């Protein structure tokens, strides 16, 4: 059920990591590969501790081993974008998230931060805040959910949501370790809870301003994969890991601006929802790395989900595409929640689409090539 | 056998838990679900350490995943009531027990603290003290008592009560860990002992004044479930876990007022017992989350138990419904013990009934609405 | 071969035991049950650390669960007698050895300390010293000696006495842990050695003055049982655990008075041995909880043992019932050793008989009712 | 999951069973014990093969060991009633079903065949025919259904009914062996099929005239238990072995007389249905060995069943209490089916109640005396 | 739990055992060893099949290896007494039960057949008949009953007597093989049944006239041990294999003569029982190979047993020392049953004591030392 690497003696490893480091510093570079969903990493040694992200040098990798580059001109380039403390090696070592560029310095096909950053800079005075709810499922190496009966199923759903106890919550050791690692690293983690499906979990990131939302979620995803690797289990972001009467996985996105958060900001919330109602197909394509096919296995209109074909909005409606919390409606200010994005969405795509539709008043089925 | 989660490498988890936290603080919210027996929890991040319960924010959860609300209006609200230190994450993180309210702010069906608190405030000058003896059995994930022979039975009862040794006491590691965690958290745990059935244990909570009795017992129950989850075993509060000639599980409740604790207070003890003798059926219904059916499997008048049908009382009588300790009768002051409540009773329901019958002079089969 | 409780993750338990305790203090009460050989225990919480044994309150327990009372009037009472530091929970927690009294305050049937203490007060000016050598065998949960071949036997005796090495000494981890725990608790442990039988061991307690010999040996027995519970093995004091050509288990008792320890004290040693020669049957009955039946399986006159029904004494004779060490005989002062008591003897019975015969000049087959 | 006896080398047994018997003949005596549900057996040696049941001698057993008598007059007696060929020992050995009588030669409490034979003799010319469909569940020795995932569940119902394949039929080896064993013995087995719940099966016995129905069903149950003993699994007749969304087990009874089998015999069925409608409570009590404490957990009105408190009828209605097959109504001739009795019913009780209600026109809550 | 030899491939052995033997004949010699309750065997080759026991040659063995002699005149001799067909090697191979004689041609100490045969010849004209019920317990090689839970107990007694099913009968494969093996060999086996304790069984031998009773029972015991050797389990004849509330094992002896079997033979039974009442202590000593130190742990006066120190008799009284069947009393002819002998009794000793007291009118303490 668990990997062979996780059966090695971990006490031996801790003895080596107790050795004082000395003067050199380790930096781990992290980037998104050609599938748009996977992460890659490698480590270099630095002479001294970097104080800001601008002090880190550019790097490179062979793009033919990541299905990102052609044959002859295979070299790709890494440009640091955000820096965090490394929870796996501790201070003064760092984690570095990078943008990917081709040999001719054009952005890579899966490099979506480059365009999203420019869009964020166009509306910086409105101070957009984002909050994302990442759902995932812990799986054994055999392709079955962790802690499930072998070749079988646990009891029916209902007691597992926010559950406590040996027979209710599976794999809380991973969840606790991931929570503390994110806090140490500097990732803005807001909370966690157990989900309807046993061995299914959720963590919230935010509220984050502008481009930082995508950076924090991607690094949080990397930390989860690396923590699960220590325990020998697999975390999956597939929207429908188990077919049938078992809960799916999504990534709800909460959105607000400076105008929405002030008194009588509910008026501006309703304006944005009206604009979103006219671009349902555009956001479905942008909320999936495959264009909507992945989300079709999840958004069928059952198990507290909305239909993939129809747009709906309402106050305190958890079955609609867009939900206004009851407290927000009562206080006439706050935010609203988009429940359409799938659990494997790219945050840079999702946040860029929301700004384009709601703040830049874009129409049609294509993004505006220059600005808005 | 134990759960798959308990076979993960716990040394790995402690490495992550050793990371310094930083400035943010974790708060775990805890509430009682729609069955009136189970507990639920989830965690949010706070900006700074809360000093009192009054400065924690309200929260919410989806009640359709806990069988507490219907479809359209499913949002429920959490209101903090009592705060303790978190033994699983250590200072400055907190545990928060909450009351549950519906979407229209009316109390939930299983929210019995709201009415119990008002009753306790009616008799605050009499200073009621409660002491509760919680019995439970440790279970394997296969539904059999922990440490019992597979598909079989251990030796006859008699050597397991207050026992010591590998062949006499099963699961003392859980008991020791639970005791220390409660002391750290601030729960008023008074003692523990091994019970007549092997793998059966007991811990005592009190003496607690007023509404704080229910708060301390529920948090103690939560800590036990969470501790057992680490070891991979299940703690059950079922009154009769094993049929036949094996000891059952109850929750004895000790009761005293300021008048009973003073000299010649035995007179007021005798008066309260007389009032209790006239309301046997009312207390049987209130001492069970199912109206008394659960307690029928345990209270059959055998193995040092009282009859479910009959009321009896006496000094130093462990076979009666109400027992006056021999010391209390000798010093003519003290308290008395109600031995009827089952091990899965709700403390808020049990304590409210005692106040209504003994201090508010209520009669009939229904509680008196507003005042007494 | 070992218990299910011992396969739980002990690292998890140590995390909880690392939590700072706070202001409250745990006290474990220990007493002897109705079989005269087994120990019982339970824990209560105190508000502050007790400084002397007189500050601890009286307690009680249900005697019908320990075969010490039946029917009505089954409550028993515990009176603290001696206090030690708790090695399992560390300072400021305490272990408390108690005397048992029935509901009418008469001493219980197996409470032999009450009479033994009064006898020791009658000879206080002679300062009797006692030293006892407790032998025991470590056993697996399957009823076979620990580390022995399954359904088989190890090699013949001879290399195991005071042995070192994986093939010579079984279970030294328990012996080392028990030694350190006794030193921490304050028990006057004098040494240990491996015995002729593999997995058989011995520890020495003393020299102890008066009634303190019984208190120290009983607490050492409890500590041994509790330590073995941690490792998942059973320690047995049965005189002949394995039938045939395998070493038995005894409890040799060394005795001396102030006159015996002074120069030319060998004269008073010979006087006491002369008195002992006339009361062989009386001491055989008092050296066993069954009146001598258990010791019959051991004292057959083989394997360096004396005959059960014959009395003998000599200098440097290890086959006699009473042995005078050669050093003592050469220096004309010291002590002497009684080799008759079985390994499961009650120390209060053994010490009381020695005082009555040697210092109070009692005759007949019954103890003198009043003083002397 | 399987018994220790099933892990013995079965090839060794087959060698001994191939030895020629000689001239002696074995005979196995079977009778119903004091619970009214289980069976008991023992073997004796006869000098020659009996040609009919009337040549078998009487026997006896100890009734105190079977919970059928006290210690004063414990002896009970066995009178053979029906003979069958032995499928476990082959010819010329026999199985004999016996009636149980007290020491005073009066029928035992669970001996329901005596009165049923007397009742059935009174309607001989009508030639009543019976056919019963017996359902059962195969269980491992751990108390879980055989082949189910450990501490878990298989997929939801729907593919298991009459299924074929490793993932659809659990334990067909037992079913095939039982079918062939019954045919060899002379049991009138009509067919088998796999049931809705996995590891649940059904066999049909009949049409058997008169008292012969109870003899054939009881022997078939004994053969099933004995066959399952060879494989090491347990056959259970519980009405609801698994709680929840899983099918229960019943024993449908098919009834017809000569009149209903003749031309236009459908009209004689209608009076039988009409007569049965007024005695629903009386028949429910006689359809359960525990008076209704078992069938109450199956007849819940769901899973295509009928409610325990309501009587229904109709042509080709499987949800009613009584079903008339569609072909029977089309041909206006045949039988009708009673779906009320549980799987653990006594066939003698069921057949007697049907005869005395539809053929003797009995009323009231008590069986008629010599008047009927 | 089973022997290493039983895990060898038994299919390989059956291949060799199917080879045609040829003209040589195997004969196995069986005799009782120096302990008086164990058996020994040895095999030799004969030129042709013996037609009767009288043409089997005498043999010999080493008595020092069997502890029936010292190292000076260790040689002993075997004289054939009874011949049986070999069930383990099939025809024409044979089993031979032999008497043991010293080097000086005098009977061995445990050779009780020699004197018993002379006693039977004295009263041969009355044709005494004997029938013995031999009880035994099946054990694993670890010293625990076969099929019992590891280091534990099954459910309480009551369903195991004459039970059927995987959870009620333990090890019926051995019982079925032994029954068929005895019939093939010519042993007069009368029947079998399961006993009160699980894994405990019984078989009956008789009615056997005179000296043949001891021959048939001893061969039956040998066949059981040899059959159990094939399966890898141990059959024990200990009177009290498991201490506590678990049934013991005895060897009930049924006795009758021609007068008792004739008309009005009940009056002759009363004389024998009256004569038996006087020599209770004499028979108790002769009913135990250890003189009474084995049967003392069974005849406790509980679990339907008679106290070893009390003689009692009565019609159909299973708690008495002597039982008269109810049918015998009603028919005034038959036999009577002696319930005193233990399971490990010597049939020659038991049958000789019954003849001496009831038929020869002997009295006193020691047997008559001359023929007349
Ligand atoms: N003003 C805001 N602007 C943007 N995001 C916000 C704002 N306020 C809160 N959020 C984010 O909204 C999210 C709240 O989601 P949470 O999981 O706590 O509740 P929920 O949506 O009611 O739950 P569920 O999982 O049942 O849908 C968090 O990620 C938080 O950071
Ligand atoms: N004055 C008091 N008022 C209320 N509760 C009290 C008072 N004094 C003590 N108690 C409570 O009474 C309980 C004592 O019960 P404990 O389990 O120690 O003994 P017991 O009832 O005699 O034992 P058993 O488990 O055999 O019934 C504790 O929970 C304690 O807090
Ligand atoms: N003066 C004394 N009075 C009483 N006891 C004493 C005195 N001096 C020593 N002792 C005790 O005598 C005991 C000696 O036991 P020890 O195991 O050393 O004996 P040993 O001679 O090696 O014998 P063995 O081979 O039987 O174990 C110790 O318990 C010690 O405390
Ligand atoms: N005339 C008859 N009288 C009595 N019993 C009959 C008669 N004809 C057939 N039977 C019996 O009725 C039974 C028919 O059961 P069967 O399970 O085959 O029917 P069904 O309608 O498919 O049942 P199910 O409720 O399981 O779907 C058989 O045992 C058969 O012997
Ligand atoms: N006339 C007789 N003389 C001697 N033995 C006889 C006679 N008739 C029968 N027997 C033998 O008596 C034995 C009866 O044993 P069986 O177990 O059937 O008796 P039971 O009364 O049921 O006793 P229990 O309940 O104590 O086992 C058989 O071995 C049988 O051969
Ligand atoms: Mg959420
Ligand atoms: Mg959400
Ligand atoms: Mg208590
Ligand atoms: Mg109590
Ligand atoms: Mg020593
Ligand atoms: Mg010594
Ligand atoms: Mg059918
Ligand atoms: Mg049917
Ligand atoms: Mg018998
Ligand atoms: Mg008998």
Residue numbers in the entry:
A (entry chain A), B (entry chain E), C (entry chain D), D (entry chain G), E (entry chain H): 2 to 373
From the manuscript:
Loop conformational heterogeneity was also influenced by nucleotide state, as the filament map with ATP only displayed partial density. Taken together the E305-loop is sensitive to nucleotide state and also by filament state under turnover conditions. All maps had similar resolution range (FSC0.143 between 1.95 – 2.27Å) and showed defined secondary structure and amino acid side chains in helix-12 (266–288) and beta sheet-11 (313–316) on either side of the loop at similar density contours.
